[PDB]
Enzyme design. Structure first.
Site, short mmCIF file in Angstrom:
data_model
loop_
_atom_site.label_atom_id
_atom_site.label_comp_id
_atom_site.label_asym_id
_atom_site.label_seq_id
_atom_site.Cartn_x
_atom_site.Cartn_y
_atom_site.Cartn_z
N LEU A 165 -58.67 15.52 82.95
CA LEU A 165 -58.50 15.31 81.52
C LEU A 165 -58.37 13.83 81.18
O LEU A 165 -57.82 13.06 81.96
CB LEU A 165 -57.27 16.07 81.01
CG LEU A 165 -57.23 17.58 81.28
CD1 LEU A 165 -55.95 18.19 80.72
CD2 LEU A 165 -58.45 18.26 80.70
N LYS A 210 -47.09 13.55 89.90
CA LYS A 210 -45.89 14.08 89.27
C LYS A 210 -46.04 15.57 88.97
O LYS A 210 -45.09 16.34 89.10
CB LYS A 210 -45.58 13.31 87.98
CG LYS A 210 -44.95 11.96 88.23
CD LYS A 210 -44.96 11.10 86.98
CE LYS A 210 -44.08 9.87 87.15
NZ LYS A 210 -44.45 9.08 88.35
N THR A 250 -30.76 6.19 70.35
CA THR A 250 -31.98 5.89 69.62
C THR A 250 -32.40 7.03 68.69
O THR A 250 -33.29 6.86 67.86
CB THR A 250 -33.15 5.58 70.57
OG1 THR A 250 -33.51 6.76 71.29
CG2 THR A 250 -32.78 4.47 71.54
N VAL A 279 -30.46 8.10 66.54
CA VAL A 279 -29.91 7.62 65.28
C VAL A 279 -30.93 6.71 64.60
O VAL A 279 -31.28 5.66 65.14
CB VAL A 279 -28.59 6.85 65.47
CG1 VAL A 279 -28.04 6.41 64.12
CG2 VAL A 279 -27.58 7.69 66.22
N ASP A 304 -40.16 8.78 51.54
CA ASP A 304 -40.80 7.48 51.40
C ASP A 304 -41.68 7.45 50.16
O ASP A 304 -42.34 8.44 49.83
CB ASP A 304 -41.62 7.13 52.64
CG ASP A 304 -40.76 6.96 53.88
OD1 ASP A 304 -39.55 6.72 53.74
OD2 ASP A 304 -41.31 7.05 55.00
NA NA Z 1 -33.60 5.41 66.06
NA NA Z 2 -58.55 11.16 84.32
#
Ligand code: NA
Ligand code: NA
Length: 327
Positions: free
Chosen positions: A56, A66, A95, A97, A248
DNA sequence: CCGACATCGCATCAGC
DNA sequence: GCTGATGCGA
DNA sequence: GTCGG
């Protein structure tokens, strides 16, 4: 593709992604793991080996090893250790937060501040943004059902038109694409008096009105073109009060508005499939403009745009309804 | 072997 | 006081 | 970490 197809793997990669961003401060490794996680999540087969997954795009050698270890043993040693680690896990958690990034999180943990309670014990060390993020930590991690979004939209469109009936407002994001839930509300705003070659009070007037009717509750940042803040639907009768939400509001010049609408409607994957197809025809499209490539690659002046479809026309492709822009 | 990996508005810091 | 760099979220 | 010049 279902979650339990390769979910153990994508969760692994997503976990690794967060530690790279928040602890290692390697933003490019962060997106690397996320890209791999996405392409695996779209893979309609249960992965048997790392070699299979390596086929992929976005999956290289390191991730293949892994996946092998995870497939063969059910876990990853590096991940197990970094989870147990007091420093790394604390830095990573803080983080979450809003307002606290990798840099601020490491600072806090360096001087002993590791938890939400530690933060509450030391508010004079938090800037204005971080305090709001701390105050609404739980609320900010909740999603917003479309029904609540529709109610939120009702207020925004109403109050905006009440300030000046010539405003044009559009709630974009995945909401405009018909999603059943949202992470926040993204509002795009324009006005016939505001073009590129052009008052810088247009945004303030709208924000203040939404504050007057107590829809907007807090402010993260506010300038002449961009507002980032907090909002809340009114509580119903005797009912439990709604969560506070992120909202936003962008002020965009008229001639860049529909390029803006298209861009913030998404999705991300759609916008690149569209950007790729756009260049094949000799056009360059960003958030602001659609421009014509010259014989050498130079940009011509920005083309006239008066609707989303005008852009679709320029690059010889039929209009797509927002509900069919997932890719 | 080695650079790209998107880019910008706003808040706040580093420095003059 | 200012200008520019950096952090942050998007 | 992955891809590709
Ligand atoms: Na943050
Ligand atoms: Na690949």
């Amino acid at each position: 593709p279902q979650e339990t197809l390769n979910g153990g793997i994508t969760d692994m990669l997503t976990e690794l992604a967060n530690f790279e961003k928040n602890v290692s401060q390697a933003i490019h490794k962060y997106n690397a793991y996320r890209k791999a996680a996405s392409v695996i999540a779209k893979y309609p087969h249960k992965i048997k080996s790392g070699a299979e997954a390596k086929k992929l795009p976005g999956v290289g050698t390191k991730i293949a090893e892994k996946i092998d270890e995870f497939l063969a043993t059910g876990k990853l040693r590096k991940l197990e250790k970094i989870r147990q680690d007091d420093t790394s896990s604390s830095i990573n958690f803080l983080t979450r937060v809003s307002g606290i990034g990798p840099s601020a999180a490491r600072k806090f943990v360096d001087e002993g501040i590791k938890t939400l309670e530690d933060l509450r014990k030391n508010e004079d060390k938090l800037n204005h943004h971080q305090r709001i993020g701390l105050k609404y930590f739980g609320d900010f991690e909740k999603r917003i059902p479309r029904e609540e979004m529709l109610q939120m939209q009702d207020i925004v469109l109403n109050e905006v038109k009440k300030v000046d009936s010539e405003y044009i407002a559009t709630v974009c994001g995945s909401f405009r694409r018909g999603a059943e839930s949202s992470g926040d509300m993204d509002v795009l705003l324009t006005h016939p008096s505001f073009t590129s070659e052009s008052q810088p009070k247009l945004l303030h007037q709208v924000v203040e009105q939404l504050q007057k009717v107590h829809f907007i509750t807090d402010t993260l940042s506010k300038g002449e073109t961009k507002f980032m803040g907090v909002c809340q639907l009114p509580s119903k009768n005797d009912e439990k009060e709604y969560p506070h939400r992120r909202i936003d509001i962008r002020l965009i010049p008229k001639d860049q508005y529909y390029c803006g609408v298209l861009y913030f409607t998404g999705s991300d994957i759609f916008n690149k499939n569209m950007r790729a197809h756009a260049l094949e025809k000799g056009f360059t499209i960003n958030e602001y403009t659609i421009r014509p490539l010259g014989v050498t690659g130079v940009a011509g002046e920005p083309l006239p745009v008066d609707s989303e479809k005008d852009i679709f026309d320029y690059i010889q492709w039929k209009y797509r309804e927002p509900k069919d822009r997932s890719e």
